[PDB]
Amino acid sequence: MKAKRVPGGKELLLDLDAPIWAGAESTTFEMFPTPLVMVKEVSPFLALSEGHGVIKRLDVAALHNGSMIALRLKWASEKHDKIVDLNSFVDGVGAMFPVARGAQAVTMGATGRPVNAWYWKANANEPMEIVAEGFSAVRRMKDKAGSDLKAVAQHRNGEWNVILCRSMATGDGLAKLQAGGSSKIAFAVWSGGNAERSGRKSYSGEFVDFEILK
């Protein structure tokens, strides 16, 4: 997919109903259940997961203004944005980028081949920065590791609409997202209604090209 340059300020890119989003390049990703049999050594119990991955489609548009880059993500879901019981889970979405050469999205990277994921949860104020060296070493970074990753979200008419926004320039260890550059991207989405969290989810599959234009 391609992130197009747009003339506005950060409060065009953070405005879910901004007409600019109406002309963005939108890519529909088929979402598949994660192959959790793969996680047997990390959790034999998680590997027994049945029926995860109920969200089959995630629409994503990407725009930037040279200083911040924004992803707009949209999918069909009931609104599970609150822990209402001890068995309750919340909706979530993740966008992942490689931070090292040869990092594979399907394993969430590997030792020495890290990936960086923007992670939004419906009951969280703020999104989280995750750095992972395999699904066996997925770390949430303290106070975003200095990142300004922001999120805006609204559920309406059976869909989540969320924007994940971040400065284009970042320190070491977080995804390099330069204008005129090309990274790679993958997504996961969690249905809180289907008890989806951790590895129980659907995902876009392996990394696809992510071209940041201008």
Added chain:
Amino acid sequence: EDIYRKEWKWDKVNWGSHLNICWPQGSCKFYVYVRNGIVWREEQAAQTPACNVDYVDYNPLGCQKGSAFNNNLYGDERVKYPLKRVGKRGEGKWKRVSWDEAAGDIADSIIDSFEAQGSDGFILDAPHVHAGSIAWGAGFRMTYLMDGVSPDINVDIGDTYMGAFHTFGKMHMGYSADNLLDAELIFMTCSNWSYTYPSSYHFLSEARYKGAEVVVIAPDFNPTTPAADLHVPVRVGSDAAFWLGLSQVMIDEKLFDRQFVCEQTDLPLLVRMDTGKFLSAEDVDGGEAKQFYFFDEKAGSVRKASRGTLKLDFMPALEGTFSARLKNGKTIQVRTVFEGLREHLKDYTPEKASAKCGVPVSLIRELGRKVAKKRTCSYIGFSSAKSYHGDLMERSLFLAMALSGNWGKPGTGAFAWAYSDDNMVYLGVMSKPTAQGGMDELHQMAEGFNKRTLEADPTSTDEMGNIEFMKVVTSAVGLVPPAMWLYYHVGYDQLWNNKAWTDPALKKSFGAYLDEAKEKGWWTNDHIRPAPDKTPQVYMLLSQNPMRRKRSGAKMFPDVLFPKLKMIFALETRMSSSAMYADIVLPCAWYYEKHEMTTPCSGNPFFTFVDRSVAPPGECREEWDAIALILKKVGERAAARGLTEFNDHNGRKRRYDELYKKFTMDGHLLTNEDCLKEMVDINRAVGVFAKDYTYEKFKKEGQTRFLSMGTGVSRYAHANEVDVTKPIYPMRWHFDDKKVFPTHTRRAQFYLDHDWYLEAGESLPTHKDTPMVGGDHPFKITGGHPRVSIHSTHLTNSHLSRLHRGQPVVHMNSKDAAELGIKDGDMAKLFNDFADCEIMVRTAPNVQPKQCIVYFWDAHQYKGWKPYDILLIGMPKPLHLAGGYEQFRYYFMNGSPAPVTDRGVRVSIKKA
């Protein structure tokens, strides 16, 4: 890992315990952990050693209510400011006022009633000790100074052993819990230690492992049965038949201890076959009316049974029918009580007794044989006293104990009702401190009674001298049988004279028996108070909650009493159901928030210090201080109103302006700490504490074993000295020393030859089914003290209420419920001919068919605030109005008809 380590921190630790009357009072010593100026938590100190190396210690003590009491101190059940009623009584509309306003209104109402009609207008109704010994002392001292009326706490609650009273002439006997370790056979009956004695239940399970056989006699397979080898599934109220079956076994199989029976009891005394009365020397040669006879078979003659000792110099006859020539020259047949009993027990063969109590023959015969051969200790709980015929049930158990020689010996006993209450009663009556000679008048009066007693009868014992003293002093201080004022002033005559709800073997109603009894001078005007022509006007709630405690009080109080009352005031820590109907609620300091001492009995025989760990919150006051302030206000308000004197019940004048000085001993007693120090001095003076065991030592150690039963009834009733190196058990003086019993016959007396008993069919222990109190309804309702609370203290506690369903529950047999279309968790109506209530249903197989159970709840936990108690009536046993017999008598906590007979009341149940 430091986030949990964070929690295990505090600022200071003090000694604490709880003054709520668990019973036997646990007197559990806790560490009270304070932080940020608040009680954070508590934990048992577990510093109560065994009596000696061979016994189990008492550690750690405690229970779940005590161990979570910090939650009470910060709970929304607390009243922290004086409240004054705004709406109707019970409407739940209150406003905060000052202590000055609140104590002022109370004082004015006291004054108003005293001016109108003298001191009979004030009733401190049956306060318990939950607020503390010092609070009990305060309330009693106040009422005594004012000559107000104080219905008897023990008779009012229904904690008595009238069968013991009538058999032995006393009831204040006990053992300590470790005494079970010396028993080979243990009977838990009319009791539920799992719920009611968790601090020392362990002695029961540990006795079991040492080899003691544990038997629970209960209609239901009750919560104590996890410690039991045997459940004896008596029909509710049928225990007499069980115990008579056991006695029949021991007699028929010749297993009884003949020597013990002949020495200790009336079983060998001769009874006239013409009149049914003991053969007396008056009858035979014109001697004493109370000189009785054995038959000496070897001698071929009647021989005088000594009134002065139980020691035998020959073996009296048991079996047989004999003759005696009277002073008339007429010869009559006479036989021993035993010979009558042999006849009577023909109706209680195991087959017949089984038909009557539902216990299998095999078990009756097995236990008959075991009781005769095993050192046997019982715990009869206070469901016995709450059974109409508990006296019969108890007499029958004591007959089995007699026949097996099971008293006066290590590992024997029946209950834990020996205790020193000297600290409370001297605090209540002395005019000056102990250290100033405050006990001198009482101690010289006590001697007077002894001298007078010996004069009347030189064979009399100290124990008898003490009873006479007690009879007099009880009435001198305004402690009165609670049936009287309930009957005359709260409309209970309309319930208690219902012949449908009376034992059908009786020839007349409660009130008819009352009239006969007062005609004979058996009850006087110092018993019947307030007098029938006075009106109660001021009613003080202190450690008492009539809306659930009084049987049918939830109806009779609002409908009959409250309308006559000008002032109802409560000294409370908590918004009780009864306080909701008060005009004034005065907030009090709770446990850990005021200096106190626990009030132990034989069971857990140690006093424990309760520090003031934290200041009371809001405007909570200690009860002594609260009462002191009321009394100052009485004086001040009287003075402002230009009034000087009021009349006491005998028409003597007392000054309003001296009440406060008298109460406080001219400023010497203002605070709990003041009173605690005085109670320590009292304990030292009477031998309960060592003479050198000062308050300083008490505060530091936090607890101490008591060294004696003090100077009150227990000292003599218990009939043994306290030796802290061995388990406490009663009646040793009777057995080892051959000390006489304070009874008609001078013996442990199974034949009561008083006319009322003869006519009622109760001269011997006998089985009578519970009267059909409530009408002809198919369930018999029983109860028990709550596992989940000490009385209502914790029934309004959120934290503790989460250990259970948080609401009133009736336990029903599963099939019974199923047959009524009722499932577990359904609501049900309980009802009878008198009233009804709604309660959540618990179904269990462990409930006896046609039994249902409600462990009590506070009244405002029920829909419409109608507790199960509303339907319980409280029919007092009319035979307990009897006088004209040595052991038929009233003094404080002992005797008079208890309006408490709720166990086995009839109810119907339907789904709601």
Added chain:
Amino acid sequence: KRQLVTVIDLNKCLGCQTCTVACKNIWTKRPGTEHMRWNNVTTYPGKGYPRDYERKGGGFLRGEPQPGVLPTLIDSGDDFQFNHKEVFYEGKGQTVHFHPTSKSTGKDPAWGYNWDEDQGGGKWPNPFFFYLARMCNHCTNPACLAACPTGAIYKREDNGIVLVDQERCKGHRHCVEACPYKAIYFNPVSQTSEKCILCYPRIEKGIANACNRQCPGRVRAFGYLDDTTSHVHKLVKKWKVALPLHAEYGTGPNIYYVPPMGARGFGEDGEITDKTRIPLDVLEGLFGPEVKRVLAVLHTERENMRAGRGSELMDLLISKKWSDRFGGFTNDPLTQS
């Protein structure tokens, strides 16, 4: 490597819940822990705690991990709210009464912690029940640990205490589903899971854990399983009268229970028998195939005592000196962290 263990003598347990409150009043009055009864006591037969935990999967079968399901707030005993203000101060008179409200549904509860108290099983005149105290078993092969994909759960090598690292925990709750005892509990405020910490702040100062120390029934013994002088070693390893709860769940639990002897039952003829009414297969369901042997040992040893022969076993189970139950954890509870 060592393992702290508790022995719980079901003959002695009186269902008083002191152990419940002992735990709660140190550890589980924090927001989000109020429903947690890390030490829990319920009546058996019953639904247990959490409700129907024995139906909720987890653990291992043939050493095969089993899927599990999450308990609800209600399953976990709820956190009943009460209405003091409404009853006392709102001018509603007798039209309202003091009663609980579920924290989950906001309505009257139809279940809660210990709701099936004193109910049990059997059929009249042979009803049976006993009280069953439970905590985390600090398993040798903990399913919770195996289940957490973040590796937030660990087992201390020094004393075998299993802990959830509250900083690393993300509240995934796989551990909760995996623990066949349902002895890990979600904290919806922190959004982590919590569990019995074997009072480690206390035990590291030589102070016995609170649920053991505060038990008035003197039911509880505590110590290191390898300590041959301890009650726990003598009951579990030597006499072998203290049995694991649901060992078939595959986790190697390290709480051990002395099964209940129970009261003699009545026969089909209504007469008293010489046998307990508690069905052996019921006790076997909980404590395994050794129950029959154990009951026989208890009865034999009890007879040895009664007959004047003595019995170490009875001496151990009675414990005339209370502090001897605690395996050297005898410091007074007066040392802070």
